[PDB]
Symmetry: C3
Subunit: 415 residues, 3 copies
Amino acid sequence: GLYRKYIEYPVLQKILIGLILGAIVGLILGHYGYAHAVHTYVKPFGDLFVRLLKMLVMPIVFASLVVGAASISPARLGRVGVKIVVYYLLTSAFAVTLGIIMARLFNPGAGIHLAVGGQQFQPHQAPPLVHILLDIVPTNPFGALANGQVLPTIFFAIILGIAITYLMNSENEKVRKSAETLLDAINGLAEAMYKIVNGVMQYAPIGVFALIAYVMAEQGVHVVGELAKVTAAVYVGLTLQILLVYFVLLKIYGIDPISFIKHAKDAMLTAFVTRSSSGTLPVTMRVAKEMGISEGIYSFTLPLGATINMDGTALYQGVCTFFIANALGSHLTVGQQLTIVLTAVLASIGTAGVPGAGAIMLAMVLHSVGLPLTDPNVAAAYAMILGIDAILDMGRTMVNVTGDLTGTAIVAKTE
Amino acid sequence: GLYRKYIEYPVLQKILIGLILGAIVGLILGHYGYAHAVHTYVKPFGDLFVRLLKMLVMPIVFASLVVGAASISPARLGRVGVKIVVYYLLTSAFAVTLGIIMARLFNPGAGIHLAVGGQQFQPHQAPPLVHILLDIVPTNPFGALANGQVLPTIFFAIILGIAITYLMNSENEKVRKSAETLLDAINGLAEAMYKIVNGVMQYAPIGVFALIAYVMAEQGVHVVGELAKVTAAVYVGLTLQILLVYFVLLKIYGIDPISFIKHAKDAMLTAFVTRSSSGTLPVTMRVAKEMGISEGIYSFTLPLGATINMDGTALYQGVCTFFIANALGSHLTVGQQLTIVLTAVLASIGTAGVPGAGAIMLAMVLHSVGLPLTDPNVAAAYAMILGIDAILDMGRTMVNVTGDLTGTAIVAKTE
Amino acid sequence: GLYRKYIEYPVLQKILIGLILGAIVGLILGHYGYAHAVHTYVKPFGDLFVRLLKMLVMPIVFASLVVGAASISPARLGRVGVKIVVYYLLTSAFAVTLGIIMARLFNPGAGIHLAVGGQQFQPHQAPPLVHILLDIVPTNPFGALANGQVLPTIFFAIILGIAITYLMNSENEKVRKSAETLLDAINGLAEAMYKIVNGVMQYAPIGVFALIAYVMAEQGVHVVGELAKVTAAVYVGLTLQILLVYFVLLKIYGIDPISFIKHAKDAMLTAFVTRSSSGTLPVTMRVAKEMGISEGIYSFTLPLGATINMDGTALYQGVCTFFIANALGSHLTVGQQLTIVLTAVLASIGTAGVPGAGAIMLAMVLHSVGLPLTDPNVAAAYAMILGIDAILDMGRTMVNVTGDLTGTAIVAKTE
């Protein structure tokens, strides 16, 4: 009876209920020193939810890209790829520019209270751009599906789908039956993955409550004081990023942004809580399929953009760079923010397949200015920033996924 | 001609012939110092047989669980799971209790002849129960199928099968054809695996002869003397475990135990020789399919129980703990055997996915009593036990697999 | 327009054009000290081509061996296997014999100008033959497909194909539909892989130009002088190997060698440039499919022979061993070249699954003579050889692949 009442209750209402009571119970138990208790008792439910959403990432990206490449190969896919790459670079530049502006409006960093403490161990720089651009072609397709590797799986699935499309028009009548068997089996795998992510989103409110309860419990207390200016600057920059870039881009290309948010509420909240833009790829592809977009556009612009397009990470990089520059008391050489913008774009395009990309992206952005992370002062101020990393990480993951959904909708409306 | 005479000869007769001549030639060549010669020459045939049976473990557990979850999902699978978990915990408790009784009837351990020798390097304890209970959900399904991981493969196959069952009743007529293609391909993979394990069991007598020849050659000589009481206590406890637990449980639920043994002779002997309960999973699933049990019961209670239900290991843990307690000359505090029973059950339930589980299970069972494995005396007595590990390991693997077959038959007769 | 002119231009003409201008521009830029510039700028296109051809290696070897084992299992596959193993051992013996003769005709090694320099770190010897012969059966099929392992994939695909062939003749009518679904899906995967390798060979001239430009740029300058005798001896031995073994073997079994070369031009040139005999397996299987050979012969003798049959490596082993023997000024004990021939055959058969097999093959061939690689003089002379390793590696990979194509054609003409 009560289980039937819980299932038949709508999903977005209980997601909001879990979010609100998670924030309340998290701040209350963080205010009273019960951090280790909630960390050992409640956080495993959120870890289970994150692992349940990371389970479906690789089969859905393989299967509904093999069946997603049943579109016209020289006309559609090339134009969609070049348009979505141009879009991703443009919005990353706009996002880091707006982050620089939002950090220049506030004054984050006044007091000098830095002890040396624990410093960063010279964070290892990115591999050369040739090696990362050669990472896209896989040496083994099963070895690319076996551990991560979203970009080699994208490449292999695209090539297999184009080959199957060329295969099903052959003059033979056995090769046609073989290819129409393989395509139907892979399509069945994709539809099974969507039917699973329906039930995972049915489970989602418990994990949302647990995750944001732990986040607002451990790092919900350390946010008051000087770091509140950093949190306010990042969050105001992210909401102004949405309302002044994505709304303008949807009003230019003639789709209602309110109906767009009414659709993408699911993936936006799941990416806000889950704190991993690659771990909400099944929810993003589900909400793109329910938005009325053909497979050959969303199925390629979403898993590509979950690895390249990081807008909220770029805005946090700009705000963190300006906070490090104010902590040491530098003028920061007005006109050299073009180097910050350029390196924030080139770091996103040149750290595609590398795991742990955000840390070395922030490292090379700080290194291009003149504050390398081997200095003890910048390491102390960055360690002071890192205590509230999750509170900024939630919002920047939400904007990182909303960017992908907006770009997919723009390219699909254009084509 | 002679090859046709070898193939058309029945399988159980040549399995018994290979077993008997393997035991005879093993004791003879162990009595005469030809241990290294038989170890280098004859043991590779048994290693080839063990690898041939370990090849079929992961595809059959994936495929005939995806097609095995074509039963009613809320009614059948939940009741089968909770009943088989209750059964496994109950028989593990009964087995370690009977092991304590059988060690208390005998007097294993009289002489104190322990030098320090080579001692155990503080065997690393189990991971926390939250992490092992979170291991069940996989972060990657292909990464769970790629190296071991019977429990994440069980979880992913169950969820995929329930999704396909929900999928084949949809109102669409393309999704139905896609799902009925995928299910038929996976069913073809399962039937191909059973057709392979037929021929592997045809090969099996050479590997049985080689394996038990090496086992009775290297550790068939060190069994006489004081350790013969340990071997007799373990083997009498295992046969009394079978004849006084499984026979009573089959006579309660109304199936003939003699016909049950006449069926399960194949998997019992293969698990007796192969010395790996996970490596005789295809033979166990084949003999459960030939026993007339539907897929939704045997296909889930066998690979789950090949990782959790260890009855013979629990009985050997009880007997080894009592032997360590008699070797140091302790009273062993009558009434504290409840802690031995409780930790032998909780160690089985809390060391599910860990590889090398039996060593750290025995370690924590010895640690809960008051004889931790860092002491030199208990390390010397355990190193004296370890010389006859294979002779006990054969019988305890046989009882470990017969427990799974009995529990599957009980749940299938009930449902 | 120009892209249409590039695509519609024939493939072998632009492959020869890229080869010739690659050799010319490579020698010119190597003569002028522009080695690092061409290494950083042009070599990545060849690396991209090599990775594009290594992508298709594992799915095509799995898929068109599962569908390739739809032949009569006891009659065809056993005779084909034993005939191709006999062929591979015989031509490896002939190749190392002709290498010994060709090194004895020339006089490679006159001057003694060896400093100690950088020496080999006692190159680790091969695993025991039992362990390498047990490597053929996989402990995990998905773990064998996940990283390399051509031989366990061959074994698992053969067993799965024989099981499907036994399955499709069963009296059931659901198992037949399941097996005919699985076989058609795997056949669709194989045909998709061939349709991909068509386009990869369309891309191939850019990679051919880049690869041979870098090879003739870095190690095209160090070839003149004393090492030119080594290069001439190796290349004359390889062309005499082809024209006096493979032409005689095709004229004995009654097929025209000129039409055979007119077919196998594609795989011969791709193996000549790519410098990896396992990385031109899709081109070899494509040219064997276009040569009119049934699947059950080429599909098994090509991926097996890409791991065992190394004829050009055997000839280079003989010539390098004789060069090391002339560098130290030894008589080399006429009549002990039987040990060189025997160890060059047994090293090929006993280092099958090991990665990095050629180095330890040359190591054990040098060790069986009396010049172990721990001596400083032989390490200095081998380090002097290693400067022109690529120039010999191109031709010896070409002969290594032409051996497989010749043996497949002989067994297919016989059967």
